[PDB]
Short mmCIF file of C-alpha atoms and ligand atoms in Angstrom, two decimals:
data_model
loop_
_atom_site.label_atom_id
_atom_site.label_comp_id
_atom_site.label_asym_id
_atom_site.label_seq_id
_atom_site.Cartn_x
_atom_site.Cartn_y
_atom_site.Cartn_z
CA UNK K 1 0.00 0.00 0.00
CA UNK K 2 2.79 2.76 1.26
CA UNK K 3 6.59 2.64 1.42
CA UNK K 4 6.30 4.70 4.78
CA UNK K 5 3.30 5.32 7.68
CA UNK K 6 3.37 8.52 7.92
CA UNK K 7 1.50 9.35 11.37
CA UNK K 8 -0.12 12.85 12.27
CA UNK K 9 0.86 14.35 15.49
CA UNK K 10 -2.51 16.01 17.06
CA UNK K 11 -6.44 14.48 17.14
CA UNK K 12 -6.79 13.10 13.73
CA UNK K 13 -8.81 14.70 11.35
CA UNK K 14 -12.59 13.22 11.01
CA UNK K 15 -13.77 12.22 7.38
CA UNK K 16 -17.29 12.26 7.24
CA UNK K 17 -19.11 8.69 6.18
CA UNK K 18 -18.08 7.80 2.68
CA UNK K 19 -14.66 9.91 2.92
CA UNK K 20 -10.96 8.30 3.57
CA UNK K 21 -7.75 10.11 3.40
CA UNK K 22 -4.17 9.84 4.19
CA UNK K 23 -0.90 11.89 5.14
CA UNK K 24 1.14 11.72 2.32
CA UNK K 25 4.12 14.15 3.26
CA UNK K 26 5.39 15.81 6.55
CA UNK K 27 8.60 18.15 7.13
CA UNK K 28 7.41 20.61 4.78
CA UNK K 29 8.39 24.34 6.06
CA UNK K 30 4.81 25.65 5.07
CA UNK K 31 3.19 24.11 2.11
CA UNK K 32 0.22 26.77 0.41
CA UNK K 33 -1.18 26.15 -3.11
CA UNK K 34 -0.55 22.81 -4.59
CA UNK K 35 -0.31 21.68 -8.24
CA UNK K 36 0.18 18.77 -10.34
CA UNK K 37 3.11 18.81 -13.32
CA UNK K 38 2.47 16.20 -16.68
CA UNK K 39 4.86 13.75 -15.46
CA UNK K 40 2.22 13.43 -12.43
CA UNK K 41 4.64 15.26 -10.12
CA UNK K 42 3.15 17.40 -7.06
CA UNK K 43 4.38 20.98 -6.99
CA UNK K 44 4.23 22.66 -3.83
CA UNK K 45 4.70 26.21 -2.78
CA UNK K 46 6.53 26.39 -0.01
CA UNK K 47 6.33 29.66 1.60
CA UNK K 48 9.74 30.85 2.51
CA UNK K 49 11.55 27.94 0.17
CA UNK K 50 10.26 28.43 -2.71
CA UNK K 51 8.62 25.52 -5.43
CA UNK K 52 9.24 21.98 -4.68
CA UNK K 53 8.38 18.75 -6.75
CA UNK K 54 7.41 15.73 -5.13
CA UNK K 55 7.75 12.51 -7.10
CA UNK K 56 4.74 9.96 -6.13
CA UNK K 57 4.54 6.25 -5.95
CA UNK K 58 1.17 5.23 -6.75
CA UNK K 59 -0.63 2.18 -5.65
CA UNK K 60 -4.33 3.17 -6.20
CA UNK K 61 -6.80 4.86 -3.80
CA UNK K 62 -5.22 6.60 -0.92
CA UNK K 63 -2.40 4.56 -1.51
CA UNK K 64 0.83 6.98 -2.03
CA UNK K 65 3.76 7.57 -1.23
CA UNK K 66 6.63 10.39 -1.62
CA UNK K 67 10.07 9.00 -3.04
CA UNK K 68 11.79 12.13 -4.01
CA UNK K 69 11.50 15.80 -3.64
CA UNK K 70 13.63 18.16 -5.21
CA UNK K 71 13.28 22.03 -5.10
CA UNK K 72 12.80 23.57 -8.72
CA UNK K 73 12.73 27.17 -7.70
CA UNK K 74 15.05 28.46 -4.67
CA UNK K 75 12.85 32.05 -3.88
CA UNK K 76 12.59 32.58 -0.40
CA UNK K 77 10.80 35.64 -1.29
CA UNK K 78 7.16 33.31 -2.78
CA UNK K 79 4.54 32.96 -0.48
CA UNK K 80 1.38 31.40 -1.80
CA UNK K 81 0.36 31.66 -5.15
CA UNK K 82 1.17 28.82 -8.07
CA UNK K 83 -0.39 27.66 -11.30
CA UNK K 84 1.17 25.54 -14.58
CA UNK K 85 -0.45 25.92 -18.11
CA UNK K 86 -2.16 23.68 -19.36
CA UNK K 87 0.81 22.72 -22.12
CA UNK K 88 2.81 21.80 -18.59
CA UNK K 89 5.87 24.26 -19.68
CA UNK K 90 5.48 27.35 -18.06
CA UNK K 91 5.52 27.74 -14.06
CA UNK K 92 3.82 30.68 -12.99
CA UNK K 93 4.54 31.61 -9.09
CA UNK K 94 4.17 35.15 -7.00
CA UNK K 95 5.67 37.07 -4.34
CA UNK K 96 4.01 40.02 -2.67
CA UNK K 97 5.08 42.52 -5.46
CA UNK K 98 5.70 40.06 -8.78
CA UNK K 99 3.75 37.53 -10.57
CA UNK K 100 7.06 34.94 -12.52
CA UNK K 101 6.71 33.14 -15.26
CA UNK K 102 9.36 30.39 -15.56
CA UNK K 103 10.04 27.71 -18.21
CA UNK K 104 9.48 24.16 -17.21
CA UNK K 105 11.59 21.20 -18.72
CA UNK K 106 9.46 18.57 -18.32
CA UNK K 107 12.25 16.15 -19.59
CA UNK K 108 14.45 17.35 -17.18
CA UNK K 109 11.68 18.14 -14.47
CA UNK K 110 13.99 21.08 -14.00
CA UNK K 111 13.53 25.42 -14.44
CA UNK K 112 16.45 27.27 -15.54
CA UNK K 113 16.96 29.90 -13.58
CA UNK K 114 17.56 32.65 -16.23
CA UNK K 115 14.31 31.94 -18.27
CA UNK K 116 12.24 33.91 -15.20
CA UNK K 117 10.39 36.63 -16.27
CA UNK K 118 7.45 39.30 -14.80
CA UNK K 119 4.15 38.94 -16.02
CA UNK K 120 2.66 41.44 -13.54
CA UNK K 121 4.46 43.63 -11.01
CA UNK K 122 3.67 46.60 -8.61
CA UNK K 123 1.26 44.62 -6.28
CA UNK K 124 3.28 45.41 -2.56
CA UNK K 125 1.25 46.80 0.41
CA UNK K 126 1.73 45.19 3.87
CA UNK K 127 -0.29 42.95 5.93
CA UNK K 128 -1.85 40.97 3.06
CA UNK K 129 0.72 39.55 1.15
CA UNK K 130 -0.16 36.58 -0.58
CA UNK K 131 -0.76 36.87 -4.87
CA UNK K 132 -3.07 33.61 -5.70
CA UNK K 133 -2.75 32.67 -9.16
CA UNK K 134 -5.83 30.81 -11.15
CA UNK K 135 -5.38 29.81 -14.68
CA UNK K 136 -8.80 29.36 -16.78
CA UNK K 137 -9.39 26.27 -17.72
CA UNK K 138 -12.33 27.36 -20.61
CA UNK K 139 -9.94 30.63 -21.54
CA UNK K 140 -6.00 28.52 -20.56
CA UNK K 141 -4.47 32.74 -21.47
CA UNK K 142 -6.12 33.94 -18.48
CA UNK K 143 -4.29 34.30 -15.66
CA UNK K 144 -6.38 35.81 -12.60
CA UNK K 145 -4.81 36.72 -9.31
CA UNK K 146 -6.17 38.19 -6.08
CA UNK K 147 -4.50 40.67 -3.74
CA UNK K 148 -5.40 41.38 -0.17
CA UNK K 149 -5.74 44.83 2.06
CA UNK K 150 -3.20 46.94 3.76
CA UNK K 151 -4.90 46.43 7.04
CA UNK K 152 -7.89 44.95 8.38
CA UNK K 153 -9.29 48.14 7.75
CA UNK K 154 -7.60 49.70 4.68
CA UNK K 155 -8.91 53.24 3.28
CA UNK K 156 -7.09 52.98 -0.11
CA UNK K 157 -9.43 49.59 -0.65
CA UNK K 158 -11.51 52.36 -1.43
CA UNK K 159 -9.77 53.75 -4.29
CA UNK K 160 -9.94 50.96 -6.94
CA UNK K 161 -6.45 52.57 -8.85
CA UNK K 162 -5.10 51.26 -5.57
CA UNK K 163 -5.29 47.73 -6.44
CA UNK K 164 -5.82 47.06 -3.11
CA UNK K 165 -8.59 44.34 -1.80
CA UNK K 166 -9.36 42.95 -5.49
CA UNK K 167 -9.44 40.20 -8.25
CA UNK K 168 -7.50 41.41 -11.57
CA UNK K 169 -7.64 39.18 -15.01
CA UNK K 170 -4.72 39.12 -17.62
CA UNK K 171 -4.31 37.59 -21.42
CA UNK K 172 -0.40 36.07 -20.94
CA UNK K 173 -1.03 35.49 -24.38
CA UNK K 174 -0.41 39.66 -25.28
CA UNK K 175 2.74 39.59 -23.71
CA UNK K 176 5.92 39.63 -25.94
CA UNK K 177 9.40 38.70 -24.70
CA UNK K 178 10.72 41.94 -25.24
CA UNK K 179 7.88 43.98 -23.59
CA UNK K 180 7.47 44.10 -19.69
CA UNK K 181 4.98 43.12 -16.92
CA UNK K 182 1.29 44.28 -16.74
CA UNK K 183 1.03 46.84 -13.67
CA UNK K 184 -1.71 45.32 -11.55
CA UNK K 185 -4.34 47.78 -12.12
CA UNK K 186 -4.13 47.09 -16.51
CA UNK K 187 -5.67 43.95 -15.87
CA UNK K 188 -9.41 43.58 -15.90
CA UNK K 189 -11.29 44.03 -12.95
CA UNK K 190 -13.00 40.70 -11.71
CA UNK K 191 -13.82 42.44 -8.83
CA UNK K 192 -13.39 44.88 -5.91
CA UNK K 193 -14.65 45.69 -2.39
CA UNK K 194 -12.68 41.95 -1.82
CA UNK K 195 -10.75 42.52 1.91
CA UNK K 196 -8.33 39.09 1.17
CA UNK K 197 -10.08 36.60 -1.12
CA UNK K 198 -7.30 34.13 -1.20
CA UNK K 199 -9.77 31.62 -3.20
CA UNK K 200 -10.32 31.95 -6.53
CA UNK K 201 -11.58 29.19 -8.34
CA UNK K 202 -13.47 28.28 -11.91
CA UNK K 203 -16.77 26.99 -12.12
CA UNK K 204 -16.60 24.20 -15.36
CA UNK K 205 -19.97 23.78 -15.60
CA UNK K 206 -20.13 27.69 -17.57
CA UNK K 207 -16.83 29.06 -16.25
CA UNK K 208 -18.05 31.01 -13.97
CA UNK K 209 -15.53 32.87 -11.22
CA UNK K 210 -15.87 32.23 -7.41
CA UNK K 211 -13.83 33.41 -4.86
CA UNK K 212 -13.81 33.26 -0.92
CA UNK K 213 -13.77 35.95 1.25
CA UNK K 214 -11.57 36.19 4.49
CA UNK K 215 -13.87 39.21 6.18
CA UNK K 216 -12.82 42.39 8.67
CA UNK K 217 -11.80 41.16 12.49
CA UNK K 218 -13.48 42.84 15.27
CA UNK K 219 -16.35 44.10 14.32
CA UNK K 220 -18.63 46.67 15.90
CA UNK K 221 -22.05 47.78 14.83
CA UNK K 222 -23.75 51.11 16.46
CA UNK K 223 -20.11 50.58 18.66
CA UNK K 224 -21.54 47.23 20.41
CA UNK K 225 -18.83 44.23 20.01
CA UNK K 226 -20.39 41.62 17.65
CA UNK K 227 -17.15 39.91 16.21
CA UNK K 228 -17.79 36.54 17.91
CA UNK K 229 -20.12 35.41 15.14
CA UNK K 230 -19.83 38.18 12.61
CA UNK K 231 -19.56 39.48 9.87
CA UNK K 232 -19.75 36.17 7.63
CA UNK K 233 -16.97 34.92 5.76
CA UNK K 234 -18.52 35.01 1.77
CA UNK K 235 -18.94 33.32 -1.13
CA UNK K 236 -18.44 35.48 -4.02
CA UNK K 237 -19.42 35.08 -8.13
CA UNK K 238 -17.70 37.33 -10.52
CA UNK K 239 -19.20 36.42 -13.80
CA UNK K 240 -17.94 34.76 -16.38
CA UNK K 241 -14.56 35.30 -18.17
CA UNK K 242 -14.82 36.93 -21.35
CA UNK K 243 -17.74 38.60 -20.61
CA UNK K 244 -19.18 41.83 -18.40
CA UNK K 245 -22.04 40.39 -16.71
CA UNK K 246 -21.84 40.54 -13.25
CA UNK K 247 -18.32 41.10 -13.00
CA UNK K 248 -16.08 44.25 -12.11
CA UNK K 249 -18.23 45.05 -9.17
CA UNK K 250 -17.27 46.18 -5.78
CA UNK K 251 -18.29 43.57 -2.86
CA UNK K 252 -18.58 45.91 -0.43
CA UNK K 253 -15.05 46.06 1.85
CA UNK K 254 -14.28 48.15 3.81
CA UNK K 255 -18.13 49.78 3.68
CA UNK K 256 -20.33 47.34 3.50
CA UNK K 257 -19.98 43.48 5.28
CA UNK K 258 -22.31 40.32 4.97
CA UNK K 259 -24.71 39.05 7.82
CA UNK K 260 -24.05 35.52 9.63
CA UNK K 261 -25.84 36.00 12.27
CA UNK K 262 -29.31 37.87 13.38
CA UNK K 263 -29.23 37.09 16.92
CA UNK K 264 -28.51 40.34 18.74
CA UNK K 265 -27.38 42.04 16.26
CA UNK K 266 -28.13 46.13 16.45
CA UNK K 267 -30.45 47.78 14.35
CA UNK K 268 -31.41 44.40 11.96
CA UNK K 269 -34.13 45.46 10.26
CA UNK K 270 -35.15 43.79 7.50
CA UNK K 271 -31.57 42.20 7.27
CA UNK K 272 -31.42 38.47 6.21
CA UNK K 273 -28.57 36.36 6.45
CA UNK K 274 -26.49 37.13 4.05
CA UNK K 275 -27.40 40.83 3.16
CA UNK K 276 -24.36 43.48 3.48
CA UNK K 277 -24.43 46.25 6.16
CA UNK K 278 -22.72 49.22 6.32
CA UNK K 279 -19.31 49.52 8.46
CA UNK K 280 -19.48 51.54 12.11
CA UNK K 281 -16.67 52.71 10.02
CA UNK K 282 -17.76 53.54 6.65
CA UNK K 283 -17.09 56.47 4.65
CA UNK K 284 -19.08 59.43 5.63
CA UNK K 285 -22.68 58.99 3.88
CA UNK K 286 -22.67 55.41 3.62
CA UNK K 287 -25.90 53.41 4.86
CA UNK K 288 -27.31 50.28 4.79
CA UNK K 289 -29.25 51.09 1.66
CA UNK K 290 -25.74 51.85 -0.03
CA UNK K 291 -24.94 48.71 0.79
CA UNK K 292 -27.92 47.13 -0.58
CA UNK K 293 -27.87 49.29 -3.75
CA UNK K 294 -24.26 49.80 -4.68
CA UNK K 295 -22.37 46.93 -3.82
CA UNK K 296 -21.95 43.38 -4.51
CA UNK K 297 -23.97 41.26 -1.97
CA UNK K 298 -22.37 37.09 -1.55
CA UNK K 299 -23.74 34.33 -2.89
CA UNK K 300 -23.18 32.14 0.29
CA UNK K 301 -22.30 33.18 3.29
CA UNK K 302 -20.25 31.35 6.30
CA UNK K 303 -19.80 31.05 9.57
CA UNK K 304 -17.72 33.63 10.80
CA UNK K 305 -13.87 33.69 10.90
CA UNK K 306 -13.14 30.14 9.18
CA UNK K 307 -11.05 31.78 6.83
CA UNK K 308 -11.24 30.00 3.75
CA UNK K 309 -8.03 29.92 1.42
CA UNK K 310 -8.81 27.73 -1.70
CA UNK K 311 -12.30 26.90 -3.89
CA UNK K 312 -11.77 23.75 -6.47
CA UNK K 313 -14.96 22.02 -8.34
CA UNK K 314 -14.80 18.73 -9.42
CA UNK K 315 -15.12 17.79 -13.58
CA UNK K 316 -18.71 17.61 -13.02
CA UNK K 317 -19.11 21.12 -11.25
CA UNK K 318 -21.52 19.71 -8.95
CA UNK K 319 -19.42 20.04 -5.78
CA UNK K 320 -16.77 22.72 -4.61
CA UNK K 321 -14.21 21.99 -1.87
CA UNK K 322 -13.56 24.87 0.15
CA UNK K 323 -10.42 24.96 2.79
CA UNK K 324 -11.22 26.57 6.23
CA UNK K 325 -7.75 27.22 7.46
CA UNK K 326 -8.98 28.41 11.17
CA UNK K 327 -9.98 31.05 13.03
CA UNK K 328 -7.85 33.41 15.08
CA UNK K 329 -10.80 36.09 16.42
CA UNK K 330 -12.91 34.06 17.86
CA UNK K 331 -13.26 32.98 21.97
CA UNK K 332 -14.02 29.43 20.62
CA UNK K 333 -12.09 28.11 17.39
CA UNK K 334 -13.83 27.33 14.18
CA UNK K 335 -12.95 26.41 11.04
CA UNK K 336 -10.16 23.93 10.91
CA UNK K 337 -11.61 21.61 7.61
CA UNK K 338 -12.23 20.98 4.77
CA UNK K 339 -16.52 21.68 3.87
CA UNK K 340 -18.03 20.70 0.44
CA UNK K 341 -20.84 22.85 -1.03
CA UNK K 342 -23.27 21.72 -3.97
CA UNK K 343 -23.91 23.91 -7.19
CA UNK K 344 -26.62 23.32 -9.64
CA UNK K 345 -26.71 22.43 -13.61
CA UNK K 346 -26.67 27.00 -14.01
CA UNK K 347 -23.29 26.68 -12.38
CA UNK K 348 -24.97 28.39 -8.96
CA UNK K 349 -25.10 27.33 -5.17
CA UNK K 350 -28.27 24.88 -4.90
CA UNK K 351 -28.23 26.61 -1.38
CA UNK K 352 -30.10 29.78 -1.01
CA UNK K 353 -27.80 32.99 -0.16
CA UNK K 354 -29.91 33.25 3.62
CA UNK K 355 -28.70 29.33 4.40
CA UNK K 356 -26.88 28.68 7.26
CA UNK K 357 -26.29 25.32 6.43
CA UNK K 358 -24.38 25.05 3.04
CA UNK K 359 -21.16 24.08 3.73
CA UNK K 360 -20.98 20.33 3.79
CA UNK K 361 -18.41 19.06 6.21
CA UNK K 362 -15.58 16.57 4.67
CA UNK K 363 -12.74 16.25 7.11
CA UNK K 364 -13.04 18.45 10.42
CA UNK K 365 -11.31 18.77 13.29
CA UNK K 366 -12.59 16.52 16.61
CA UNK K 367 -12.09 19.34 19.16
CA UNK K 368 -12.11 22.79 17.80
CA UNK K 369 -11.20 24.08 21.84
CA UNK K 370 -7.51 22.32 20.88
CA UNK K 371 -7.19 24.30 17.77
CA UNK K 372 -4.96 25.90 16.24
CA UNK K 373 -2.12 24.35 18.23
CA UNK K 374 -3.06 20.93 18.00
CA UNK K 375 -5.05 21.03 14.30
CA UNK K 376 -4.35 20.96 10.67
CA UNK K 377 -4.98 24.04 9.03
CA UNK K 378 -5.96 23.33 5.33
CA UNK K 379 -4.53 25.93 2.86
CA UNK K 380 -4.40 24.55 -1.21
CA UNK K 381 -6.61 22.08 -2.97
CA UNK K 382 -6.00 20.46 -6.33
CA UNK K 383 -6.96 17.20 -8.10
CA UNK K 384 -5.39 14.57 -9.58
CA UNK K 385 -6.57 13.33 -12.98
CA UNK K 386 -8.91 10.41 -11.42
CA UNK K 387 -10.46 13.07 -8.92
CA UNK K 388 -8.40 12.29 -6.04
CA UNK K 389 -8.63 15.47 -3.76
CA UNK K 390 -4.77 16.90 -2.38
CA UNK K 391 -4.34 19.47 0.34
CA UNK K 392 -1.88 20.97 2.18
CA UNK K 393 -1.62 21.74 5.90
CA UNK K 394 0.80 24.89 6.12
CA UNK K 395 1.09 25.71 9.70
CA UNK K 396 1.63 21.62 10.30
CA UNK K 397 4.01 21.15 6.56
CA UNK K 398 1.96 18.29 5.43
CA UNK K 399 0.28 17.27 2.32
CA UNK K 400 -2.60 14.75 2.54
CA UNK K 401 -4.80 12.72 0.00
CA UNK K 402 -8.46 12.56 0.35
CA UNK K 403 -11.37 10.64 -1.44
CA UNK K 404 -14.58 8.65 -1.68
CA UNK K 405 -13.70 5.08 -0.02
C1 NAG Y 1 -23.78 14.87 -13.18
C2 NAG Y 1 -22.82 13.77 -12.84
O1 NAG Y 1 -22.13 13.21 -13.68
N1 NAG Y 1 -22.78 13.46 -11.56
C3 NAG Y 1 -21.56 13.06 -10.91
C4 NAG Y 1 -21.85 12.74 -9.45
O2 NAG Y 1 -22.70 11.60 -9.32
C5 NAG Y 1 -20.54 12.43 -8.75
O3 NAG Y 1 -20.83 12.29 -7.36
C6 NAG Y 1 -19.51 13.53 -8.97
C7 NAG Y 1 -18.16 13.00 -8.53
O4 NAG Y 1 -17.91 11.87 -9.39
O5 NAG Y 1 -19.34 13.88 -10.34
C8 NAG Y 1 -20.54 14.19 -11.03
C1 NAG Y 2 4.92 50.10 -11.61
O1 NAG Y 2 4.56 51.28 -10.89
C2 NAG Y 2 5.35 52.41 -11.22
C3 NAG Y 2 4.99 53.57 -10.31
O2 NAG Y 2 3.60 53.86 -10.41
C4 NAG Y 2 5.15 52.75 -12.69
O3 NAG Y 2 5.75 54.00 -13.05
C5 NAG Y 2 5.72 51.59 -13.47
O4 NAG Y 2 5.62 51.83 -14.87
C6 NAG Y 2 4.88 50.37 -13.11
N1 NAG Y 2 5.33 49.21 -13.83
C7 NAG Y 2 4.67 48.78 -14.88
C8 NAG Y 2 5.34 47.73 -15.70
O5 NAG Y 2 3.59 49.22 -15.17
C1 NAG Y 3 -14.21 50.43 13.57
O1 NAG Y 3 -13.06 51.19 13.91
C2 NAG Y 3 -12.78 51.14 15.30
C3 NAG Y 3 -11.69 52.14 15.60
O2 NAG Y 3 -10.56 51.87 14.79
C4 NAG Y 3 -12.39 49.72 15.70
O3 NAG Y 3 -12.12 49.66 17.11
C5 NAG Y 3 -13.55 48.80 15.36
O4 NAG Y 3 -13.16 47.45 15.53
C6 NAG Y 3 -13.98 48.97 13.91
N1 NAG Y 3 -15.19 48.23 13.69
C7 NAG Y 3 -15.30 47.30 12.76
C8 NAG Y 3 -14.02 46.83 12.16
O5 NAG Y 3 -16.37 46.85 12.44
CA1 CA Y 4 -11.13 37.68 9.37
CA1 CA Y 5 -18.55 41.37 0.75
#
């Protein structure tokens, strides 16, 4: 079955009935998004080494085994994002300021140095730091990635020629060898309003764009403290690439956040689960209506503070995975697993945007009081070609398979 037993070293992870998995690879320094090469080769990001291959053994099901690992890029300076073409020859990785491009060998399973070039540059700020990187699938020229706030409250997310808080697009194809990196802001605008929506993923049913929203800490509405269970962690849809319909709006941060929950919650009004408020600190002006009328209300909402940081469908497009790396503002944890959530043949949530209840568990964690110490915290998501489900655990360096038993 395995040429080693790899063992975790906290409460095991709980796969809900139907649902096996296995650790796969430990000693990682902190493993984020996750790729596979054409040779069937796992590429890792990880943060602070830079891109590492890990050469699999495969004996079927959960069955694998890491032989080899050799580091293909040495950039101390990448820190999340990753995505290959589709032809398998170009590497594309970020750092906070620079979106590479590198040439793959994959007769080698080597990059040469020298071939590195910027696709996209100028994207720096502090606090949120991580570039993700999503090629299309239906459009394989178009490269989105998705860039964070300044703070947990950041002013300039206001100003969209900041480039701050939001999801740009960008045709690699445009871009000669002898002309220079897109500045952030020439891409297109999937959207803005987006405080650090680390997942971006592609719908294959239509193509449509989702990403997942890691929402403002310590929140206050009319001053009282209602962080505990607010505002919602979201669900976003940005259209469809190649097109203008709903896409390029603003989704509300830092104005306007998205209702979790009702109970006790100042001034509710005709608020439903998963409605957008306006911000105790909001730009002067700025009501709930102008949250209702100019902004970008989810599609789903979640419980607050599980910070999701990847969103993968299966071929079908009838189920995403979603990675709930943890909560750090909350009195009692949350998060900590790995949920499922079920879209319909018009590429949408079958899940109403006021449930509660959408996100399916998969793996959680047994006792959320021990977290994050003594849990996993799921980061990237990626499938194999037989629909095998990998993820990596950065703050534990581990890499685990998951699937259907
Ligand atoms: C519409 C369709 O083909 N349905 C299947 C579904 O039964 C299966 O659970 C999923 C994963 O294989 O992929 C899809
Ligand atoms: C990056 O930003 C600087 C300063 O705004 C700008 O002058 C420069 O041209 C930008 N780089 C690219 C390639 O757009
Ligand atoms: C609003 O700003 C105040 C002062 O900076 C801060 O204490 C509070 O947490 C903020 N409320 C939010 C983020 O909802
Ligand atoms: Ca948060
Ligand atoms: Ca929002």
């Amino acid at each position: 079955c395995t040429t080693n037993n790899l063992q975790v070293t906290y409460p095991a992870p709980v796969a809900a009935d139907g649902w096996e998995y296995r650790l796969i690879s430990t000693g990682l320094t902190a493993p984020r998004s996750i790729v596979f090469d054409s040779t069937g080769g796992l590429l890792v990001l990880d943060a602070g080494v830079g891109v590492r291959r890990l050469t699999l053994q495969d004996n079927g099901g959960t069955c694998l085994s890491v032989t080899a690992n050799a580091t293909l890029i040495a950039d101390t300076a990448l820190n999340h994002g990753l995505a290959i073409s589709a032809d398998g020859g170009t590497i594309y990785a970020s750092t906070v300021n620079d979106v590479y491009a590198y040439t793959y060998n994959e007769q080698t399973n080597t990059v040469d140095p020298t071939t590195r070039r910027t696709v996209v540059t100028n994207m720096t700020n502090t606090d949120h730091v991580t570039r993700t990187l999503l090629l299309s699938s239906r459009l394989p020229n178009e490269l989105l990635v998705s860039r964070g706030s300044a703070a947990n409250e950041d002013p300039q997310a206001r100003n969209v020629t900041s480039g701050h808080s939001q999801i740009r697009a960008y045709d690699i194809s445009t871009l000669a060898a002898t002309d220079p990196p897109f500045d952030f802001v020439a891409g297109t605008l999937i959207g803005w309003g987006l405080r650090d929506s680390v997942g971006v993923g592609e719908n294959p049913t239509n193509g449509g764009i989702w990403s997942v929203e890691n929402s403002v800490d310590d929140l206050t509405r009319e001053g009282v403290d209602v962080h505990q269970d607010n505002p919602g962690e979201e669900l976003n849809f940005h259209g469809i690439l190649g097109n203008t319909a709903n896409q390029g709006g603003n989704y509300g941060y830092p104005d306007c956040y998205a209702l979790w929950s009702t109970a006790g919650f100042p001034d509710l009004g005709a608020l439903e689960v998963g409605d957008q408020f306006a911000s105790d600190n909001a730009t002067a002006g700025v009501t709930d209506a102008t949250c209702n009328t100019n902004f970008v209300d989810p599609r789903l909402v979640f419980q607050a503070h599980v910070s999701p940081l990847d969103i993968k469908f299966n071929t079908n497009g009838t189920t995403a995975y979603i990675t709930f790396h943890g909560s750090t503002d909350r009195t009692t944890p949350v998060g900590y697993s790995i949920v499922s959530v079920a879209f319909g043949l018009n590429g949408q949530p079958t899940s109403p945007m006021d449930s509660t209840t959408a996100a399916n568990n998969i793996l959680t964690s047994p006792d959320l009081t021990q977290c994050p110490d003594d849990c996993f915290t799921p980061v990237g998501l990626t499938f194999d070609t037989i629909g095998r489900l990998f993820f990596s655990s950065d703050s534990t360096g581990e890499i685990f398979v998951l699937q259907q038993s």
